[PDB]
Amino acid sequence: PLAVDLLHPEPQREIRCHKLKRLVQHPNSYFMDVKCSGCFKISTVFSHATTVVVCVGCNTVLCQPTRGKAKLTEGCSFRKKQ
Amino acid sequence: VRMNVLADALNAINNAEKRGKRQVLIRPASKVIVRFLTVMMKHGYIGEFEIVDDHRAGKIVVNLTGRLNKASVISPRLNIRLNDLEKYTNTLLPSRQFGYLILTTSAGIMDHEEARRKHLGGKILGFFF
Amino acid sequence: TFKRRNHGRNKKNRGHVAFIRCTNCGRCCPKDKAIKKFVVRNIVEAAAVRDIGDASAYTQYALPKLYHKLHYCIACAIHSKVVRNRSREARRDRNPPPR
Amino acid sequence: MGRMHNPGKGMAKSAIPYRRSVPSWQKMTAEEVQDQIVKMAKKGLRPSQIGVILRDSHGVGQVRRLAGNKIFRILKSKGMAPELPEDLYHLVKKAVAIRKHLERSRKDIDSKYRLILVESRIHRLARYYKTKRQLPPTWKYESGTAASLVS
Amino acid sequence: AKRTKKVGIVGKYGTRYGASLRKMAKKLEVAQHSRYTCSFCGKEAMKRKATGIWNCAKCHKVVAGGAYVYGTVTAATVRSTIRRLRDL
Amino acid sequence: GKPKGLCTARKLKTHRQEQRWNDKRYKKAHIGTRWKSNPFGGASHAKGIVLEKIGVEAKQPNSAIRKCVRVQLIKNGKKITAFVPNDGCLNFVEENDEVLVSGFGRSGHAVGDIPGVRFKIVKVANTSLIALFKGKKERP
RNA sequence: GCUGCGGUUAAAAAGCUCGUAGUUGGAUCUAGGUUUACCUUGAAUAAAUCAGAGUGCUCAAUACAAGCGCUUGCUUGAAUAGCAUCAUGGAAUAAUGAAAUUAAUGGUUAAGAGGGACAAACCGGGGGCAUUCGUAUCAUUACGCGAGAGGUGAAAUUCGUGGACCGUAGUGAGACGCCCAACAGCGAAAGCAUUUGCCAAGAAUGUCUUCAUUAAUCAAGAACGAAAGUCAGAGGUUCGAAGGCGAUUAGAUACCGCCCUAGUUCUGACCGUAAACGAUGCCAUCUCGCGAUUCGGAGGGUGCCCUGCCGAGGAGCAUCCGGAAACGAAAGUCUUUCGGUUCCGGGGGUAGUAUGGUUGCAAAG
């Protein structure tokens, strides 16, 4: 349409827009506290982690790198950090 | 490789105006672009514009009043003296009654009318009408 | 004058395409350009299927089929009427003709 | 990635957040992150790998934001700068590997083409670093010595 | 300074025997008078003693090679075949 | 497209000079062999002596024999063919005659249906051919 | 044609890529309530000519005269403007420099620029070297058959009772990888397709990883570059220039058929040309709709489906504008011309010829 509000875009469009083509760029990634059943140590982890993040002393693999976002090991949950 | 942000911005404005859009987004902003748009605003060829900040060059969003026939850039920035200002205006502008020729002088960025009134030359930036 | 947007072939994103030998003339034609047809037919003609069935040595025998992928160059295809010249507008029609 | 010698118009890159401030839940100190970077450097990693590790395991989104200084600048300030910049070293290593493969397979014309491109990139980057005084003025990439230089 | 534009080692023959024959002889003369890296000590010290015999100046090993080259393509292929059959 | 940088004057000027040589007029006027190739040596008129007279088959579809005369210029001794305008004027031209000759009009190109003839006689025996045709004068 | 041309088909985009000189280069520092470059104004700047006041030489070109009182006179006009150097002011634009006893001690940001790193039951007829398999062609062995087989529009040359052709089972050589196979994929282009092993390389995608302008295009220069062709060595199955025959024909130095030589195959060197075509150079950006397709990602459902989902390709049909038109989502955003840059054209021939130079063994470039 001729009249489109470019200044205040629709939030659904902004979410379903490429990260670089938004009115202001914003990454689609996030940091998450992963909780693994067992040693119950919250571990900060990058969503698209490319290395194998390991427990500190718990010495277990928490995530597995992939082509996109890192795949959390089974039995581990995560919570987004603000 | 991008080498003239002003040229790209004026091309985007021209395309949006031809398509009849009410707003147009200009990619990387700059002081030169801001002053060009400000002169166009003072002369009434565009509506208000908003400079979107994104911790980089930024963007602009200009409201179009559907009153601009053409906005173009002259590259390279040739040096215009007061003596040939008349020839350049007669060559580039559609008529003597309207249309403005934007210069960049030491006093700043202005139109050829103000440049002549202040008796200033400088480097040509573009024109609109 | 350029007759066709695709220049008479089916070559996109490609530099060179290996050729085939036409079934009739033997001429070399690019595989994309050569006109292909897949012919599946009964091994026996419709006029003799009944004769072969009545002469069959088995209670119920399924008659096999011949499968042939034929490639024709443009000249031999036109001569055999596998394809025909079309009007300027009808040339752009790409849907296979009714069978 | 971009396009320098290839016709690749990729649009894949990192999108830095607008917020230039450290997150509230980030409790590493500006000096502790420096000592961690320095421990990793002593171990033998380079700035890209150090940043990857910090982002992946320790939650450091941006070292420039947390420590207030870039990783290479930190290592230079404390005197751990490498003789060759990371990208130049990697390019020279790639060229050495291509030459080693070509010495065995001499009909790999594609490898010859890639070697030409890689050496052109090496020369351009070396010119840039000499201009920025980050390499000795008489530095020059020698195909014979490159293996030892990069190993 | 480069003394000969193209004749090289074969310049000893002057203007005799024909350009094509001299060109054909140049390759083999260069090959037979070149030094080769010894596979045992690793130093470029393999030199032809007689047709087919190559001496290493450092480790003093004598090898049976080609007439004008230290090794031949056919010998290399035979060695590769034997090694492959050994592996599998 | 052409270069447009503010510091490309050398490239523009050199390219223009280089491409001027691909122009027929500029090359024709600056080649250097113009004087040697042109029978008149850059002049507009010349003088010569008659040798013989010829009739040239006019080009198709025209059918006629145009009556020209082969002349030898006095300045350089070159042989040319010159046309004798007006009707029955070849009679006033006899072998071994002094003639003034000029261009035909197209600057070294043949004119009309006469093939290969690019000059024309303006005076014979110091007389104007037009006067001879008009009867204002007679053969000396 | 700088203003200001044109290069899909009319003449004209180099086959493609790397690359020095040259040209051109992202944003960002007092907004408000030291050097340069550049612009303004002056200084120094022979006339004659050009532009330009006045004056009836009768007009005018011209010329620079002349015009009033009265005699011993007064006033006259004979103007005005037209690179480099120096100075003044201006501080936008474009370059350029600063720091790696107190004080905020001193590094802009991290480009929907570029490079590099990392990820992947990653993706791919991308490349190279070995290797496995496949029928088929030809030759040949064994056995059976019995007189035709082959080939054509029709024939003939030709092969065949020394038993051909045809069958079934082998053996050997070299070549080639059918079907799958596509408006499918990869590669700078030329090009790339049987299995497996190994070697080096790469795209896109993901990234809150790193450097920080390192970039675009590129005279000279350099790599690669189909087929044919040349040199040397191996191979020589098939096909097959040249050659020889049988046909057809008025002739047939051809089309058709038969037998074939170079070649076609591999290794190592030459040549550097193709309608090397998309007859459209490369980089950046804007302008529409639809539904399909290859790759990767995100979110859901059960390898497949769904998300008017996100990027990157390769296309197709709804298409503003453009174009001489054919037609082009670019060949559009151009008399409203002006983002950067390289090459090329200037009526048709002579002619890509002569000559000179240069590369090549030659052919030739």
Curated annotation (Swiss-Prot), chain C:
Biased composition (Basic and acidic residues): 86-96
Intracellular or extracellular location(s): Cytoplasm, Cytosol; Cytoplasm; Rough endoplasmic reticulum
GO terms for MF: mRNA binding; structural constituent of ribosome
Disulfide bonds: none
Keyword Ribonucleoprotein appears in the UniProt entry: yes
GO biological-process terms attached to the record: cytoplasmic translation; determination of adult lifespan
Domain of life of the source: Eukaryota
Primary location: cytoplasm
A GO term from the CC aspect: cytosolic small ribosomal subunit
Entry keywords, A to Z: Cytoplasm, Endoplasmic reticulum, Ribonucleoprotein, Ribosomal protein
Subunit field text: Component of the 40S small ribosomal subunit.
Family: Belongs to the eukaryotic ribosomal protein eS26 family.
Full protein name: Small ribosomal subunit protein eS26
Encoding gene (name): rps-26
Parent sequence residues shown: 2 to 100 of 117
Curated annotation (Swiss-Prot), chain D:
Key word Nucleus present: yes
Subcellular location field: Cytoplasm; Nucleus, Nucleolus
Single Gene Ontology MF annotation: structural constituent of ribosome
One GO BP: ribosomal small subunit biogenesis
Principal location listed in the UniProt entry: cytoplasm
Source species, domain of life: Eukaryota
Annotated CDD domains: Ribosomal_S15p_S13e (cd00353)
InterPro entries registered for this protein in UniProt: Ribosomal_uS15, Ribosomal_uS15_arc_euk, Ribosomal_uS15_N, uS15_NS1_RNA-bd_sf
SMART domains: Ribosomal_S13_N, Ribosomal_S15
UniProt keyword terms in alphabetical order: Cytoplasm, Nucleus, Ribonucleoprotein, Ribosomal protein
UniProt keyword annotation of rRNA-binding present: no
Transmembrane segments: none
One GO location term (cellular component): small-subunit processome
One Pfam family it belongs to: Ribosomal_S13_N
Described function: Component of the small ribosomal subunit. The ribosome is a large ribonucleoprotein complex responsible for the synthesis of proteins in the cell. Part of the small subunit (SSU) processome, first precursor of the small eukaryotic ribosomal subunit. During the assembly of the SSU processome in the nucleolus, many ribosome biogenesis factors, an RNA chaperone and ribosomal proteins associate with the nascent pre-rRNA and work in concert to generate RNA folding, modifications, rearrangements and cleavage as well as targeted degradation of pre-ribosomal RNA by the RNA exosome.
Family label: Belongs to the universal ribosomal protein uS15 family.
Quaternary structure (record): Component of the small ribosomal subunit. Part of the small subunit (SSU) processome, composed of more than 70 proteins and the RNA chaperone small nucleolar RNA (snoRNA) U3.
Protein name per Swiss-Prot or TrEMBL: Small ribosomal subunit protein uS15
The species this protein was found in: Caenorhabditis elegans
Name of the gene: rps-13
Swiss-Prot record, chain E:
Zn finger residue spans: C4-type: 38-59
UniProt keyword Ribonucleoprotein, yes or no: yes
Keyword Hydrolase: no
One GO CC annotation: cytosolic large ribosomal subunit
Keywords assigned by UniProt, alphabetized: Metal-binding, Ribonucleoprotein, Ribosomal protein, Zinc, Zinc-finger
Superkingdom assignment: Eukaryota
Gene Ontology terms describing biological process: translation
GO molecular function: structural constituent of ribosome; zinc ion binding
Pfam family, one: Ribosomal_L37ae
Family: Belongs to the eukaryotic ribosomal protein eL43 family.
PANTHER family on file: LARGE RIBOSOMAL SUBUNIT PROTEIN EL43
HAMAP family: Ribosomal_eL43
Identification of the protein by name: Large ribosomal subunit protein eL43
Classification lineage: Eukaryota, Metazoa, Ecdysozoa, Nematoda, Chromadorea
Gene: rpl-37A
UniProtKB/Swiss-Prot annotation, chain F:
Residues carrying Hydroxyproline: P61
Protein keywords: Cytoplasm, Endoplasmic reticulum, Hydroxylation, Ribonucleoprotein, Ribosomal protein
Keyword field contains Ribonucleoprotein: yes
Keyword Mitochondrion annotated: no
Signal peptide range: none
Location in or out of the cell: Cytoplasm, Cytosol; Cytoplasm; Rough endoplasmic reticulum
Any single biological process term in GO: cytoplasmic translation
One GO cellular component term noted in the UniProt record for this chain: cytosolic small ribosomal subunit
Single GO MF annotation: structural constituent of ribosome
Assembly mode: Component of the 40S small ribosomal subunit.
Family that this chain belongs to: Belongs to the universal ribosomal protein uS12 family.
Entry protein name: Small ribosomal subunit protein uS12
